[PDB]
Ligand binder design. Structure first.
Ligand SMILES: [Cl-]
Ligand SMILES: [Cl-]
Ligand SMILES: [Cl-]
Ligand SMILES: [Cl-]
Lengths: 158, 158
């Protein structure tokens, strides 16, 4: 499989897992590059939507292929990334969900909750995530299309 | 605490859990009413984004307060609901995340994966979810505001 470009993002509550995941993934041949949008210290209290939207915008703008996002629960980063047009983001902490996030939902964003999941499970799931690639000709693509259809309702004016 | 109006939604892969959850919640004094947007049979192959967006639109339009959504993984329904302006949706399968979905993220939508979670855990989490109420004056409200700020970029033309 070809390697993918990743963005990674966290808030203050996700820093140590982010660092561990970044180290783990920097050795992986399915990762071509990692773009770290921060935060890079627990001292940085930047609110999670800013880091999530920045990382999601890198996907929309063709700079990366997927993003991995970490905060306390991984919920707010997923909500935030889903607000970006054409971006589909999940919070997932089990192997079946992570597979389906790609193969059913074509979700470019995977989010973890540092305060709820353990680091080895998170590393394992992130490694598995990279091995699935969405089939644009699948029956699932027609369901994803209904989401994209809804997104056509909106124009970005600001 | 005052009772809340709920919408409930599922696709074909979420029907039996939806029915069990609806039965469980119809006895709960924190639920004032349940609006079921379907599907109501495993024979109905309506794609999950339609049911999710319909249920999310009930919240946006002041018809219900929250929605519970069930499909195979609960991921696509969450993605879909997050596309609706002002709606914040999560997939959550643990007690800490469900609390924070409300108290941190002010998420009106909770989603479950029938194929990944068990029915008693799902019932328990849905009951707990109703007992938390977001504090609009909290520090978290300022973070949620950053999401709402981003949503201001878009106008709905169709
Ligand atoms: Cl948290
Ligand atoms: Cl797992
Ligand atoms: Cl599934
Ligand atoms: Cl739990």
């Amino acid at each position: 499989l070809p390697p993918l470009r990743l963005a990674i993002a966290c808030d203050d509550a996700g820093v140590s897992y982010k660092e561990a995941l970044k180290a783990h993934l920097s050795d992986n041949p399915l990762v071509s590059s990692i773009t770290d949008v921060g935060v890079t210290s627990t001292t940085d209290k930047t609110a999670y939507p800013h880091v999530a939207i920045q990382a999601a915008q890198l996907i929309k703008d063709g700079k990366v292929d997927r993003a991995l996002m970490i905060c306390g629960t991984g919920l707010g980063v997923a909500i935030s990334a889903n607000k970006v047009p054409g971006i589909r983001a999940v919070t997932a902490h089990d192997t079946f969900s992570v597979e389906r996030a790609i193969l059913s939902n074509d979700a470019q964003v995977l989010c973890f909750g540092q305060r709820v999941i353990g680091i080895e499970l998170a590393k394992r799931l992130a490694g598995e995530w990279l091995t699935y690639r969405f089939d644009q000709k699948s029956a699932s693509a027609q369901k994803v299309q209904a989401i994209s259809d809804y997104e056509k309702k909106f124009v970005e004016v600001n």
